[PDB]
Design a protein around this ligand. Structure first.
Ligand SMILES: [Cl-]
Ligand SMILES: [Cl-]
Ligand SMILES: [Cl-]
Ligand SMILES: [Cl-]
Ligand SMILES: [Cl-]
Ligand SMILES: [Cl-]
Ligand SMILES: [Cl-]
Length: 398
């Protein structure tokens, strides 16, 4: 299992290593790009040729509040090769920059997208759309308010426009926590859990929608077009799960080449106090679930979480499931099923060392285009002032 050194980065919190960095690492053509905060809090951008281990690294003019692990960096490359990057939010005005030129690590000034509803941003996420355009998703609101906002970047006009103002409706009652993926056919997939009130134990259910027209209209797997916005009552339930089953929020999802969705998360068995890793997927006709490992060690979300929220990639039913577990010494770990429906899941460790509070993020585009799995790997703590730890790209042997 081959580790490619990048550079040392901040490790006192998990800001560089959350599951919801979309993306920390991204390939365009034969170049791979990475982003992180250095030990002084500066946003660093880097790139290499995929056939080299020599990085060009550039400390930008920007800093982030790295003591708040919410305040992540998400990046993406558009069809003309410009880096788009958004960073350093926890209910704050939008921070968004772009490369000054194709493939450049140098950024211009902070810019608006649409200039509307950009005062209270959390969780910036980018996804590439067919033809070179980009999608941007974020949570708008402070003091417990949350709403999913979705924009599109037209490569042609070089501008952002709003796609949905209200896609998921909490009806002034509840919040949602979501994840998305744009499949190899350009379909946008969306899944989420509800959170009924302040407390994490009030998370419940896994819901799903998809769009074939870059976010304008939305469908269920069973073919019905949604009447928007999507509420508790009309949502498609991929998996019905109660409150108080240790169901976690804000994980990740993927799809196979055929456009079938796969969702990776965790929750406990009814007759147990031990959360277990899960996969939920739809085969075109039915939703299924499987438990990935047989953990022994209990924990509860109520009141550092001992396991990481997961990532997955899929190849025609074959699943590679990336996680981290105190039971395995907090190494980077992988579970593999030849066939998601029927195989036993074989577990291996991808690092021989602990990465502690690390969660996985991966080069989504390299998997889609080249079927290679590269992970952003760095030891971090749930913040003790520790020395910055080396960031690697882990090039996975499968
Ligand atoms: Cl190595
Ligand atoms: Cl700054
Ligand atoms: Cl929300
Ligand atoms: Cl994607
Ligand atoms: Cl596939
Ligand atoms: Cl079903
Ligand atoms: Cl088997």
């Amino acid at each position: 299992q081959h580790l490619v050194e990048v550079g040392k980065g901040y490790s006192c919190t998990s800001v560089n290593t959350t599951v919801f960095r979309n993306n920390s690492l991204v390939t365009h053509g034969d170049e791979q790009y990475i982003s992180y905060y250095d030990n002084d809090g500066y946003l660093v951008l880097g790139k290499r040729k995929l056939d080299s281990e020599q990085w060009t690294l550039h400390r930008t003019q920007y800093q982030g509040n790295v003591k708040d692990a919410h305040n992540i960096i998400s990046m993406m490359i558009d069809g003309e090769g410009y880096i788009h990057v958004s960073f350093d939010h926890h209910g704050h005005p939008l921070n968004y920059c772009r490369s000054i030129a194709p493939g450049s690590l140098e950024l211009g000034d902070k810019m608006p997208m649409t200039g509307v509803d950009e005062g209270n941003v959390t969780y910036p996420e980018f996804y590439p759309l067919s033809g070179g355009d980009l999608l941007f998703v974020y949570r708008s609101g402070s003091s417990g308010r949350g709403n999913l906002v979705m924009n599109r970047y037209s490569l042609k006009e070089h501008k952002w426009t709003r796609v949905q103002d209200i896609l998921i409706d909490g009806e002034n009652k509840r919040n949602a926590y979501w994840q998305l993926y744009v499949d190899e056919k350009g379909t946008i997939h969306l899944s989420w859990v509800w959170r009924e009130t302040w407390h994490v134990e009030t998370n419940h259910d896994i819901c799903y929608a998809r769009s074939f027209d870059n976010g304008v209209t939305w469908y269920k797997t069973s073919g019905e077009r949604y009447e928007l916005p999507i509420k508790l009552s009309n949502a498609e339930y991929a998996c019905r799960l109660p409150q108080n089953c240790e169901l976690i929020n804000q994980t990740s999802m993927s799809a196979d080449a055929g456009g079938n969705p796969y969702i990776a998360t965790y929750w406990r068995e009814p007759n147990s106090d031990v959360p277990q890793y899960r996969i939920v997927w739809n085969d075109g006709k039915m939703w299924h679930q499987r438990q990935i490992t047989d953990r022994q060690t209990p924990f509860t979300l109520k009141g550092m979480i001992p396991i990481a929220r997961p990532r997955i990639v899929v190849e025609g039913g074959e699943v590679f499931y990336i996680f981290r577990d105190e039971e395995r010494g907090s190494r980077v770990s992988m579970a593999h099923a030849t066939d998601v429906g029927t195989s036993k899941w074989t577990i291996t460790d991808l690092t021989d060392f602990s990465v502690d509070a690390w969660e996985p993020s991966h080069d989504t585009e390299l998997w889609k285009k080249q079927r290679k799995l590269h992970l952003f790997v760095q030891h971090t703590r749930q913040g003790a002032e520790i020395e910055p730890q080396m960031i690697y790209v882990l090039e996975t042997n499968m």
